[PDB]
Write a protein that binds this ligand. Structure first.
Ligand SMILES: Cc1cc2nc3c(=O)[nH]c(=O)nc-3n(C[C@H](O)[C@H](O)[C@H](O)COP(=O)(O)O)c2cc1C
Ligand SMILES: Cc1cc2nc3c(=O)[nH]c(=O)nc-3n(C[C@H](O)[C@H](O)[C@H](O)COP(=O)(O)O)c2cc1C
Ligand SMILES: Cc1cc2nc3c(=O)[nH]c(=O)nc-3n(C[C@H](O)[C@H](O)[C@H](O)COP(=O)(O)O)c2cc1C
Ligand SMILES: Cc1cc2nc3c(=O)[nH]c(=O)nc-3n(C[C@H](O)[C@H](O)[C@H](O)COP(=O)(O)O)c2cc1C
Ligand SMILES: Cc1cc2nc3c(=O)[nH]c(=O)nc-3n(C[C@H](O)[C@H](O)[C@H](O)COP(=O)(O)O)c2cc1C
Ligand SMILES: [Cl-]
Ligand SMILES: [Cl-]
Ligand SMILES: [Cl-]
Ligand SMILES: [Cl-]
Ligand SMILES: [Kr]
Ligand SMILES: [Kr]
Ligand SMILES: [Kr]
Ligand SMILES: [Kr]
Ligand SMILES: [Kr]
Ligand SMILES: [Kr]
Ligand SMILES: [Kr]
Ligand SMILES: [Kr]
Ligand SMILES: [Kr]
Ligand SMILES: [Kr]
Ligand SMILES: [Kr]
Ligand SMILES: [Kr]
Ligand SMILES: [Kr]
Ligand SMILES: [Kr]
Ligand SMILES: [Kr]
Ligand SMILES: [Kr]
Ligand SMILES: [Kr]
Ligand SMILES: [Kr]
Ligand SMILES: [Kr]
Ligand SMILES: [Kr]
Ligand SMILES: [Kr]
Ligand SMILES: [Kr]
Ligand SMILES: [Kr]
Ligand SMILES: [Kr]
Ligand SMILES: [Kr]
Ligand SMILES: [Kr]
Ligand SMILES: [Kr]
Ligand SMILES: [Kr]
Lengths: 408, 409, 408, 408, 203
């Protein structure tokens, strides 16, 4: 395939892959994404930083050939860097190693066993284990490695091109966006920061304390102000790195809007009527609302909006003494994401309709507490809400919205 | 609209609704269903048994008018029977009451409050509370009411047209099928019994002990052999009532096949490779397999197959120390269904791939035990399975299949 | 249901409905919408302008009661205005007429028969046929009716509250957005203008000549500068009317970006490889690309992007001498939309893979011409593209992108 | 992967792949499928007949190894047969050739170029072109080839294991079913014959005249009664070959039931009300009805039911002078399938609702005629049907059902 | 019956840019066209259902009663300024009849009942119309069936069924007993008048 590389600095190219057509990626909804790989031309050695998903390398190889041609160099890679073992960034490593078998593969210690377990043909490949602050010289360009375990996997690391302050952060600071434009400043800010928020919410939330720890280490090494560009493994390249670092600082410390996310499911529409009545009460106080119906909507957008919501409402009818089962998916996901690690226990209310002994709302309230929410109340009613019962939902939403606006 | 009634006995007509186009109904997948309503012409009184979902009454009214015309009677309903309050069978009750305000509404005591809570316009309607074995005379035809609380709601009852032994069972013995054919014998048996199995699995499983209790009461009264037809609220009418009663007896007592249902989810395909390797081991012992991938498949077909499986395998990768979240939906559903109430604790294995501390399979094993399964083992491995690890999956499946064939149903 | 009205001017309220949960509306994908209805309090008469979809009136009635309470007036409607017969705006008219049977219903001549055909209970209702420039006095407030046939139905009209210059335009200038925020300035501009573009593309494109004719008529009346607010029947209220009028002028006259929309379907991935190779050639010239895969994507987003694209590529494999059948849906839609009515014949290429006699690409080229595109070339190849064939796709895309940049 | 082979005759094994999880395959909906491959152990040579989809060979290799072990033979393929080039049966040919580079590949003349175009690594592979009635000796077992062009691709052929009368028919007589049971007699007949009908409808309909021509040739060679087993490339193996040959004869000659398939789409429900009223009229005559709503349903099930229906109804509302665009997909598909090639012109009616000039129903009637249907009537009405208009739909359906019953 | 193939051949010829290049059409019968666009234009009109405000009436009779009905329908049609061509199957033959149907918006067919069937001469025209398939022109011409009878009747019901099979839009049918009365001829006139109004409403 013929495909052009994109220069991001002198002798540095994006040689990634545009996954135009993907719409679901591990339960994360998106309108395509990219697998960003980078090619650094030192005077002596050419290094490839990360690669792409298995079967998607046609664009990558085309862009690598284009970059070598633009540099007046032979089609050759001398050094391979693997920041992360997950196959969306390591999937072409078997073919890169087969093509360039003498190129060493720089990665963390735990990455070696992980990569060989993913790709058995790499057994006996020239792996070179790296540690934080160790560097390699490409000839006028230096790559410095920085271990970042559990940001987001135990094998994860960042690679810094020291002379120009370009941080190849792999997943950290990435966003699932697929545009012809490669840089942060070339697309609308709302699209960029909404995709960044969704990426943090789904991938970084349980790591919020480690984010702040990594930031303290990066500032104590005096290297924060040296970062001129962040080139992540998905989406746009940050020419304004402090914009995304600032967004991460806000998400990791529980900075939220005066906003409530409401999620519900229904069989006969009664829980839906309750959800809409809670929203009316919240809106009467000028507090924003995002409304999700689990029949149609899915977990990755829901958790994006919870991330900057001060409160979360969850509603479902009772079926055989349990809440309607679709909530189980979201609850299992919230149990993993651990929103309390942002330093904020978001307020919550459980609600629902029932037709006998009930009990679904009590289960929801207990699960919301396990997920780190501050459950203020619960409201369960019999079949179709009356006018007085919808006014109670409105009043509960109104009183919640007052508490939301009072919250620091 | 103009729509023909279907005669099911002398002076008795199906006047129901064909919901051709519905594909999802409270998370239950289907290729349409029906809302069966019945019109009984006594010499003195015409009785309507159940009705239909709100906004779907055009067919029902057309069939009622057609039946009255065929009987040489006025377009009039004298008696309304409401077997169950759920709006798929009571949704046209406000219109029926408005059209025929003097017709008494026969239902259980708890049904009255439930119907008025659903439909405020019924406040002050002529409700007539009934109890088990109470009857009403329509003139040469008798309707006898039998209370059936929690089969499937606390308001539920059956209505028996005594002289012909026609049991209007409402949801009990129903199936979500939408055909032009109205009777059990007019469609392929495999379609009928598969839909019946799906209906039991999703709606009756947690009531399995009450099913057997209701069957004991009906046998003690001597009414079991008097039932000549079962006319439920969805799908086909049973001209062979002992066929569906027999199927219910088997499902309520844990009669299963030499069959394993395997369910999994995956992000990068490793848990999928494990699932397929367990299946190969099971199949090597001549044991049947049903395979479900939670990315594409949904809870109502899964639980249909668990109902006559002797074993259930559940697999998922680990994400933030938890199993992949799609399993949470199925687990919440299985917690409600309580398959252990069938009198059998189906065998189970939990499995999955992981990339660090793991833990997802220990959560799965714990949840499977809470859902009433007999968990025999759990197997978690690191990233992509090796050949030896897929042979271990095969061997575990083979050993499970041996134990499945040793179980006596 | 208790739900607050929103004041939009002195004695004028939004009393609409938030359809939070709808995700598809006549094949148009969305994240909810609104059915905007308005209540105008004259000193003598209270007018309700449009209403909502059948079964969704709970919010509307709540907001009408709230507005009457805020005005110190009884819960009473004196005048009913029906701008458009489509049931998303007329669906509550039977229940409004039943509650207020003496309130006249103002609508166009053709609307009367259309409303009675939709709602048989309105036979004998007090209909009052209106014509362009006819007005009614509410007591200190005047409503002037302006006929807009085929903008977008034969019955359509606008209602102008003359003293404040508020144009109740019904569907015209609407957008399918459901937010707690009611005004244009309260949401991100990119979201607003993207939704406006989607609404124009799907609903207004074939009416582009009538839009320009309606604009000349409005300027000839000296009434364009007198519009201070446009309050449409869906989405945000325009406090900046010239922003949306300007967008409509651009869409109605073929003002496009240096941008190509590519649409394809595939069974075995060959047509997909071609589509991605055309994109690489286009991007090499700095021309933007939007890529759609018919397996996943749907017609309403596709036509949004065609609207401001200078070129359109359509690709599909051959099956039984015909193009893959999913293209038939999009082609039937484009035949109805008539993009040539914008005054521009967008450039086009047809492409695809085949395994025998072929012919699918020739059908695509013929259909693209029937849909008003200027078809420049066709490219059909045998099974999996070779490297030379993907370079041909790249070169064709490059040559197209040069022609796109040369267009006016 | 460890996976057992299944013996189907002395020295003959199924070594195929169970695709448990696939739900859509080129727009064909299914609950998984199989890629059947077969291993024939001659005294001198072991032949592999067909293989599997790319990336799905783990099961196949496991079963080949299991079969070789059971036969006391080396893990070695001496002969490769490729009946058809489509990648669901040829996708592992690159792997197989790389492992056994001296094994000749038997295929048709046109298959060679098709396979090398799909798989460039096969350039220079030992292809052996075969013609009809040419045979190869494996040592006590003979494989005879039989060209079957356009059944279903130009490259297609059947392979006959002469001594046992086992016809490896590739796609012909296949069904998209994925069960642990391998034979026709081991699953419920309704499931088997419904899947066989769906496979014929979607893949064989336009080839109906070639099916009857191939059956003439097979009877002229005296081979029909000698066929003891049909082992196709998907689904169950026919131990009762005359059951599927008989079904194919019926489908190829227009043998239908007293049955009408009704398909429609709707925006506001009026065309749906018409569709349901036509069904009531048809059912009043004891004629069966299958109802499809294009919003939810898809082309592959629709055409399955058209195949044994004597009549087909198609309804849609008018949008910008055209029928609702979802019909375009089904019409493009029916144009390719050419149901008139079964020797029957099925009866048809076109219907719909409209709100102005209409015209959608006239387009539907035109298109139904182009698709080979005998269009008897056309009915378009204004907005919501009245009681008299639904009685007209009922009467039209009743009259159609009388004509259906009169068709011999 | 080839009307759709005519239009497909005209698109193929226009796509090749060869239509404006034809200077003369020299066919195998009759006149040579020095004005080719005149006959191509006529073919385009016939292939797309361009008709006149005109009705073709065809009937047969034994004792004259169906003839009196036919003439009374014509009077009603003519009262609306709609043209009429009248054919009597005893004398007239199929090739002139179908010439006039081709640019008629409506077609009337009448015959008496004989042994529960329509008079047999209609069978020849019906078999011919079944082959010609006038519906292939893109127009379903309007039609009425009529006749006289002397017992159980039924001939008109058969005619209506056959007209439907030949692609016509049958609006009504009228069968009467033996010789029409003045009121029955006024009914024929009124039916023809109503038909002619619908004919003028067709575009
Ligand atoms: C299959 C099924 C099982 C139910 N089981 C229970 C139950 O165990 N306890 C209860 O209180 N209500 C039960 N209900 C009643 C529902 O909770 C009740 O209809 C409720 O009003 C539905 O709320 P919704 O309109 O939001 O779906 C059940 C309903 C269904 C359909
Ligand atoms: C977002 C994400 C989070 C993960 N978190 C964990 C974790 O907490 N513990 C663990 O052992 N593995 C974790 N993993 C690694 C996966 O379990 C591992 O990749 C596994 O092999 C996936 O199996 P599959 O191919 O069936 O998807 C995580 C993977 C992802 C994508
Ligand atoms: C069911 C089916 C029917 C086909 N019919 C034809 C045909 O009529 N003419 C043709 O040239 N190719 C035909 N093909 C071959 C495909 O066009 C060919 O495989 C093409 O390369 C598919 O491109 P894709 O990878 O983009 O799907 C057919 C393929 C299938 C699966
Ligand atoms: C966007 C749109 C465009 C329409 N265009 C036309 C048109 O060109 N001609 C027409 O007669 N009706 C037109 N209509 C009106 C519909 O055909 C009419 O509402 C019809 O009754 C819908 O039938 P349904 O309820 O089955 O969807 C249009 C409707 C919509 C929503
Ligand atoms: C041989 C013959 C057979 C007839 N059979 C019937 C018959 O089956 N049913 C009927 O209603 N009239 C029958 N008739 C009566 C004619 O239809 C009746 O005379 C009619 O008015 C003749 O119409 P005409 O004047 O247009 O010929 C028959 C007439 C003849 C001469
Ligand atoms: Cl590998
Ligand atoms: Cl009510
Ligand atoms: Cl109404
Ligand atoms: Cl290859
Ligand atoms: Kr670093
Ligand atoms: Kr590191
Ligand atoms: Kr990360
Ligand atoms: Kr980070
Ligand atoms: Kr930092
Ligand atoms: Kr950082
Ligand atoms: Kr850094
Ligand atoms: Kr009973
Ligand atoms: Kr009862
Ligand atoms: Kr039940
Ligand atoms: Kr029961
Ligand atoms: Kr029983
Ligand atoms: Kr029973
Ligand atoms: Kr009973
Ligand atoms: Kr105006
Ligand atoms: Kr107007
Ligand atoms: Kr509009
Ligand atoms: Kr406009
Ligand atoms: Kr305007
Ligand atoms: Kr205006
Ligand atoms: Kr053969
Ligand atoms: Kr075939
Ligand atoms: Kr065949
Ligand atoms: Kr055959
Ligand atoms: Kr054969
Ligand atoms: Kr011609
Ligand atoms: Kr011509
Ligand atoms: Kr020509």
């Amino acid at each position: 395939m013929k495909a052009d590389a994109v220069k991001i600095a002198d002798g540095v190219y994006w040689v990634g892959v545009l996954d135009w057509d993907i719409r679901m990626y591990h339960g994360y909804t998106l309108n395509g994404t990219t697998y960003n790989a980078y090619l650094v031309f030192g005077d002596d050695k050419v290094a490839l930083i990360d690669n792409t998903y298995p079967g998607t390398s046609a664009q990558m190889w085309g862009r690598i050939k284009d970059a070598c041609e633009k540099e007046g160099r032979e089609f050759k890679i001398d050094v391979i860097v693997q920041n992360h073992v997950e196959k969306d960034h390591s999937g072409a490593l078997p073919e890169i190693h087969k093509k360039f078998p003498e190129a060493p593969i720089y990665c963390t210690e735990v990455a070696v066993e992980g990569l060989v377990k993913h790709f058995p043909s790499l057994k006996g490949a020239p792996f070179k284990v790296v540690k934080s602050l160790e560097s390699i010289d490409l000839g006028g360009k230096t790559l410095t490695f920085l271990e970042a375990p559990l940001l987001h996997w135990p094998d994860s690391m960042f690679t810094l091109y020291a002379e120009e302050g370009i941080l190849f952060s792999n997943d950290a600071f990435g966003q699932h966006l697929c545009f012809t434009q490669r840089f942060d400043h070339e697309i609308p800010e709302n699209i960029l920061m909404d995709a960044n928020q969704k990426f943090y919410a789904n991938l970084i939330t349980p790591l919020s304390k480690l984010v702040l720890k990594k930031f303290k280490e990066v500032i104590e090494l005096g290297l924060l102000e040296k970062i001129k560009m962040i080139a992540p493994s998905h989406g746009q390249i940050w020419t304004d790195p402090m914009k995304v670092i600032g967004a991460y600082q806000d998400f990791a410390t529980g900075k939220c809007k005066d906003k409530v996310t409401i999620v519900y499911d229904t069989m006969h529409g009664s829980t839906q009527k309750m959800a809409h009545a809670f929203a009316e009460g919240i809106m009467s106080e000028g507090v924003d609302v995002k409304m999700y119906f689990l029949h149609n909507d899915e977990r990755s957008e829901i958790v994006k909006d919870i991330l900057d919501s001060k409160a979360f409402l969850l509603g479902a009818p009772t079926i055989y003494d349990e809440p309607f089962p679709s909530v189980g998916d979201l609850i299992y996901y919230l149990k993993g994401l651990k929103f309390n690690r942002t330093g904020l226990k978001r307020l919550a209310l459980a609600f629902g309709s029932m037709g006998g002994n009930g009990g679904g709302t009590k289960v929801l309230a207990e699960k919301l507490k396990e997920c780190g929410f501050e459950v203020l109340d619960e409201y369960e009613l019999y079949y179709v809400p009356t006018e007085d019962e919808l006014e109670k939902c409105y009043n509960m939403g109104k009183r919640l919205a007052v508490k939301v606006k009072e919250m620091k």
